[PDB]
Design a protein around this nucleic acid. Sequence first.
RNA 1: CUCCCCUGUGAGGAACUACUGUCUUCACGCAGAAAGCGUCUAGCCAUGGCGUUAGUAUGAGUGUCGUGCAGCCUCCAGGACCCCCC
RNA 2: AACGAGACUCUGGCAUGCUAACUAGUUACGCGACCGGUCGGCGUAACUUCUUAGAGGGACAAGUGGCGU
Lengths: 65, 189, 314, 61, 139, 132
Amino acid sequence: PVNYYVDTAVRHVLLRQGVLGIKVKIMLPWDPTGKIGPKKPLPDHVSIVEPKDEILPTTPISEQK
Amino acid sequence: DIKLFGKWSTDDVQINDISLQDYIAVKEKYAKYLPHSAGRYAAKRFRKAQCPIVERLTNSMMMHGRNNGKKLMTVRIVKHAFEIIHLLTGENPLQVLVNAIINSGPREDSTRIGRAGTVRRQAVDVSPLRRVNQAIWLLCTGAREAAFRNIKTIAECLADELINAAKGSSNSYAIKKKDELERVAKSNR
Amino acid sequence: TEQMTLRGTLKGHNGWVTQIATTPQFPDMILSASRDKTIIMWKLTRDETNYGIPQRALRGHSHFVSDVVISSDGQFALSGSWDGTLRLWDLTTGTTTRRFVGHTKDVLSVAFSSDNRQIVSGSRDKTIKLWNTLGVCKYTVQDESHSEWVSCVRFSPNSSNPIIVSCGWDKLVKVWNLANCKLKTNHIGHTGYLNTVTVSPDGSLCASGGKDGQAMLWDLNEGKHLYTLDGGDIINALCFSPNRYWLCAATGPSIKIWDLEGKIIVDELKQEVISTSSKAEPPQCTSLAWSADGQTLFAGYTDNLVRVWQVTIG
Amino acid sequence: PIKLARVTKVLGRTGSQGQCTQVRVEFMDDTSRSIIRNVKGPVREGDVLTLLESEREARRL
Amino acid sequence: QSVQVFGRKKTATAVAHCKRGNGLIKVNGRPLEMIEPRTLQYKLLEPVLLLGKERFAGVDIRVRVKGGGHVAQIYAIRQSISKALVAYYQKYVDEASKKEIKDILIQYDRTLLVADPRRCESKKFGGPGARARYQKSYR
Amino acid sequence: GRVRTKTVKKAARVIIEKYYTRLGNDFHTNKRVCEEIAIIPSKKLRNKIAGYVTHLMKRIQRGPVRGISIKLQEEERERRDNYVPEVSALDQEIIEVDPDTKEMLKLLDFGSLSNLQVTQPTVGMNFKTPRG
RNA sequence: CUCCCCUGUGAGGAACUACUGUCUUCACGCAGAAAGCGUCUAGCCAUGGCGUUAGUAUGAGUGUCGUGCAGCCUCCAGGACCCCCC
RNA sequence: AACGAGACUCUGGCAUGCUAACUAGUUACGCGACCGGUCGGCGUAACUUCUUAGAGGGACAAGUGGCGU
């Protein structure tokens, strides 16, 4: 996942003293692409949809339409 | 009917010991036509308890380097060895494998105790599977050492070492190393 | 004045029996679709050692076959399967004449009409599909057909205007009218998912059952709640007797033959005598089939067997 | 005398290098005598061991 | 009257074609007894002698085998003919006689109707073989 | 060694706790239940979680599970627990009692109770464990 | 304190030559030991390996001579039995 | 609760169910040959078991029985 989920950049600054190399690692959040948020989710992540509220039955009812 | 190498009969043979009756194969079902089944008996623990005994003698005959990968060398050699055996003793050659296994296997054996370089052994006793295995080892190794250069066929020399391992003579390299093990077992106790 | 006895046991199968389908045209043969991907053709030789012996094992499926129904004639059969494929089988040549696709989920149930040109199926895609004998799909109902899976679909063989009854996991039993492709009724009695809907040859009595454990008998023509039967565990299968007016409920541990006029449970069918394996769950009853004969019962199990029941009349 | 023996239980593995198995011995003579014993190679319960010295007892390596 | 199967062992593939006939069974243009190891003769007729000759009297199998090694190919023809007489008995015969054939072939060798999934692993760097490695030395 | 990740067991815990009515003791049943109820990537995750939902149900029908609270098994354990024998175990025609207990009752004017039976005091005094 | 089923080698017979299998004697090749004596190795130390005793002392088998050993009948015994002791 | 372990990607094993193939073959029918077959010999329709490679199924310690607070 780290392939599509994060972005790494390495550079060299050139100064009197020498060169300083640098690394910047950035991680993107999840879901639909806004130019960010790569669609496919972490293989670990498990999302549970909350149960849609269901009417508790009282007495049998038959409705013809 | 199931006939070994086309001319033998497996179901008529007999086992005289209870320890080796539960392990040694080719009596009831396991009897096959040919030794090479290319099955996996090293898959799980004691799954190699159930593979055909003739195949077991077969597997151990490749045991030195140049012969290693070539299995068929053995199902050749085990072929002519049996057909030789029947000519000498005149009994079911698969009775001769049973008796050689039973007699060649150790009984008691020594386990090395001490610090490295000083061998001081204590006597313990062999497990049935271990008995079978060590026995067959002894058979194949006795055959090799005996057949290196006498210009004997390994067919001839294994029939030799097998019949001799069956009778109980000191001719067999097998019975020799066994007798040493048991004697060291006596030394310690 | 009647009792019931265990006649014989049928092993053709390496897995569960999902649905059993009998036929009037041949009281001798049965069709058993199983968890092993196989549709086995059962020949009854009625001998001493074996009550029946398998004839034709049909493999068109990469997956389990959920339900099977036969034509009124001894040739054609039909099979739904979870790989998402419905199929038209020839029991005579043992090959597949027609294939039905266009389901994106498992095919949970399929119903063949009394007129033998129509197909009405329902699926875990929450779809009720209308199929033609040549493979072509007519009308797809997304209408609120259900908010959950369709577990069973059954035709109604009645003289009054034709009706198809489907039961969902959303606890609704829905009634639909053919040729208008319309939703004519909503039946809500239930707690928990629905498993099977059956429709008597009368057309008047339809039975539905589910996790609630209570058999619900509904009136199809009038659209009125009729009766409520109390019982344990899960109703897996329900089948009506053509001539005996008996509603046979299939629950996992026990099968219950109900007499609907007197509200009397006729016989409760369970047998296990063993003390060592008694800690186990008794093998469930997956399906139920009533032969057109009325004397012979054919039931599938989680024991990967087909056990049959015979009626002792006094 | 030569005797026979039965495996009642497997307890642990005795050894420097973890060689021997330490197993429990019933006598096949239908006697109830119970002796612990050291055995080499693979052992599963129920097996029969042949003892050349049958009065000997097990020590910890 | 026609049924087709395939045997598999390692890289060796067999293809068995079963038609109604006199009982002729040939492999890539030659009978059962012309095959390369003659030592391995008896492993080839194993289902035959197990199934009886009567059930092969009405079955003509032409077998085409390419791939793998010599030994593997005989396991391949074994597989092909066994799977052939089980899969033919389904379509053109009843399931009772297929159960007879199967109960006879299964209790002897499980490799008759099944194949061994196992096939060669990949040797990787740092060693001569799959696991096996190069020597190392201190001092 | 086959052992379930935190993911597996936590997920099957919450799935069971919310959806307890929809699950059943069959594997593929709840496998297809969880392909819907939750959103899981891949396969080997899905299958494992479902396996644990199942396993956990086979432990639920036995009795109370440490991880989950459902009102349905609270209610079935309200049935199971509620019990009573035809008569109480607190009803005996003769209940035996020590002289002093009789004294303490005599303080409360209950020395008139019928059911009592005064039993002989024990003569030795050793209630104590022999230290060492 | 026994009696009577099977094992032995103690005495009488047939057989023994023809029957078969084993111990005698000669040519044959194959494995093949030790008491010890030395050496090496375990930090020091053989209870081990290796050298020399020696390819000795031996034993398993194939072909020669046995007038053998037998196998078939009896007992004299020895053990399983019983009892008995518990 | 978070990273590391796992999950994940890459490879092998399953599919006589699906999607198909003249740049892979199969079955069938012709011609060809030598004594009904044998043939990598030559061409046409038949299809996917072989041969490929996509989709998606399949295994989750699952089922039963033992050791386990």
